[PDB]
Amino acid sequence: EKVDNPFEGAKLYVNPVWSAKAAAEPGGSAVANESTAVWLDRIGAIEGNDSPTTGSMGLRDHLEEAVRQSGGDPLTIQVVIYNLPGRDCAALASNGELGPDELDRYKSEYIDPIADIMWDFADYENLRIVAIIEIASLPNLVTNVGGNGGTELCAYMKQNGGYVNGVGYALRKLGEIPNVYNYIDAAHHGWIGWDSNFGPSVDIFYEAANASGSTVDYVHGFISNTANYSATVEPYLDVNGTVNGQLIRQSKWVDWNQYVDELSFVQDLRQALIAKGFRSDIGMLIDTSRNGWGGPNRPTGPSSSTDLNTYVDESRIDRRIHPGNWCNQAGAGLGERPTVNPAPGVDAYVWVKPPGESDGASEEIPNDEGKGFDRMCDPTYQGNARNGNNPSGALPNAPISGHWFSAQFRELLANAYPPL
Ligand SMILES: OC[C@H]1O[C@@H](O[C@H]2[C@H](O)[C@@H](O)[C@H](O[C@H]3[C@H](O)[C@@H](O)[C@H](O[C@H]4[C@H](O)[C@@H](O)[C@H](O[C@H]5[C@H](O)[C@@H](O)[C@H](O[C@H]6[C@H](O)[C@@H](O)[C@H](O)O[C@@H]6CO)O[C@@H]5CO)O[C@@H]4CO)O[C@@H]3CO)O[C@@H]2CO)[C@H](O)[C@@H](O)[C@@H]1O
Ligand SMILES: [Ca+2]
Numbered sequence: 001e002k003v004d005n006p007f008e009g010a011k012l013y014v015n016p017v018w019s020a021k022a023a024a025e026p027g028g029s030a031v032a033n034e035s036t037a038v039w040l041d042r043i044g045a046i047e048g049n050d051s052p053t054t055g056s057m058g059l060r061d062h063l064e065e066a067v068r069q070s071g072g073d074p075l076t077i078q079v080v081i082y083n084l085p086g087r088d089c090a091a092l093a094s095n096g097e098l099g100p101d102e103l104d105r106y107k108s109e110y111i112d113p114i115a116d117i118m119w120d121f122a123d124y125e126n127l128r129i130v131a132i133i134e135i136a137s138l139p140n141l142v143t144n145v146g147g148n149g150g151t152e153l154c155a156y157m158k159q160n161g162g163y164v165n166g167v168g169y170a171l172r173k174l175g176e177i178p179n180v181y182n183y184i185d186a187a188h189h190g191w192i193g194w195d196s197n198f199g200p201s202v203d204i205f206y207e208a209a210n211a212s213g214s215t216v217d218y219v220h221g222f223i224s225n226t227a228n229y230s231a232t233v234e235p236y237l238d239v240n241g242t243v244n245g246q247l248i249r250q251s252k253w254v255d256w257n258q259y260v261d262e263l264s265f266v267q268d269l270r271q272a273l274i275a276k277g278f279r280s281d282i283g284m285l286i287d288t289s290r291n292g293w294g295g296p297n298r299p300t301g302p303s304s305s306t307d308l309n310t311y312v313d314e315s316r317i318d319r320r321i322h323p324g325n326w327c328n329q330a331g332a333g334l335g336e337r338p339t340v341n342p343a344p345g346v347d348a349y350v351w352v353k354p355p356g357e358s359d360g361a362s363e364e365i366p367n368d369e370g371k372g373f374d375r376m377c378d379p380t381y382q383g384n385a386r387n388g389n390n391p392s393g394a395l396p397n398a399p400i401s402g403h404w405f406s407a408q409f410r411e412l413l414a415n416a417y418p419p420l
Pocket of ligand 2: 003004005220281282283
């Protein structure tokens with residue numbers, strides 16, 4: 001009874017909190033009326049906590065504003081569920097208020113009140129709530145547990161079932177509400193694109209979808225690239241292709257990844273997920289908030305080099321030093337504006353990470369959000385195995401994750417692709 005694609009035929013929510021921040025920047029009015037997702041990054045964000053990250057609007061305030069904006073016609077608001085126990089286990093920049101052992105509190109003081117509020121809007125037949133479930137959670141249990149280079153926190157979250165059971169609980173509690181559409185976060189191609197990571201991620205998604213009373217029928221689809229920068233399409237780069245009889249996959253940038261962009265990744269992922277037992281009508285989302293890679297530095301065509309790495313590096317639109325460089329990435333631009341069904345199997349391009357909100361602080365900044373100083377957000381950091389022992393690529397003088405970052409907003413605006 002829920003619509004196939006909740007973005008289809010719908011007006012899109014404009015978050016007034018974000019809109020005001022965008023409009024206050026030089027040239028920011030050009031994007032101030034775009035739809036961005038609303039993040040519930042703390043228990044306090046549910047009622048409203050006047051924080052730097054969520055401002056003066058609680059969940060009810062947003063849903064009332066969504067109803068108002070709808071005019072009685074179909075409208076879609078995106079709400080990010082982002083407060084797992086031991087959240088962001090492979091990093092420090094967005095660790096949170098709930099520790100690894102606090103699944104019970106996640107259920108009773110976070111998910112339950114969110115569900116209670118959303119239930120109150122069930123009588124608005126034209127309001128559609130897209131619930132984006134727990135960014136950078138499940139994929140960590142594949143890539144940052146055991147072996148070398150992972151974390152003890154991620155190992156513990158796998159061991160104690162906190163991520164798997166928390167996600168399942170969110171899926172059931174929110175998915176049983178008639179106008180709620182759940183999308184599971186599915187990392188990005190530069191995270192789980194590799195053979196070693198892809199299949200096990202599909203397995204962990206299926207596990208979570210069946211945990212805490214959930215089934216795959218609570219899962220409307222999946223979202224990739226949330227708060228990341230991976231290209232939607234690399235127009236001048238073929239992952240299967242060859243340069244001078246040599247595989248593109250052998251390049252330092254691709255480094256044996258099965259994919260070089262988000263679109264091919266999600267399309268294949270969709271097929272794998274259906275094969276595993278997810279609904280055949282699932283649709284994918286790609287967060288295009290910061291992946292346009294436009295401006296003067298954007299390649300205008302394929303390189304003419306017959307050297308592999310020169311061809312790859314001159315031809316790629318994603319200009320990062322390494323695909324593992326995730327924080328406040330220098331030179332990034334706004335991507336495609338939110339768009340319904342842009343490609344086969346894709347429900348929408350969306351702006352989930354709100355442009356201008358930081359990925360993390362570039363230094364130690366005292367806070368009560370549970371957030372630490374991650375050196376991947378330090379411009380001077382020389383990296384680690386994982387990122388290929390490379391400079392971080394992070395913008396300097398960055399505030400705490402989710403806080404307003406004027407410099408980043410202005411560069412994103414400048415480097416928008418397609419052009420504004
Ligand atoms: O403003 C709204 C709210 O924002 C919140 O903050 C956000 C924040 O913006 C966001 O940045 C963040 O999420 C990031 C995580 O913190 C971070 O840990 C994660 O890092 C990933 C990385 O993206 C990925 O590329 C990397 O992939 C690795 C992979 O793990 C590894 O297996 C693979 O290994 C291969 C080798 O590279 C290769 O040599 C060999 O041959 O094969 C190997 C495979 O077998 O390598 C790749 C590449 O290095 O993994 C790391 C994880 O370790 O990235 C996330 C973004 O994608 O946190 C929040 C949500 O995103 C605020 O907190 C809130 O207040 C605001 O409201
Ligand atoms: Ca669908």
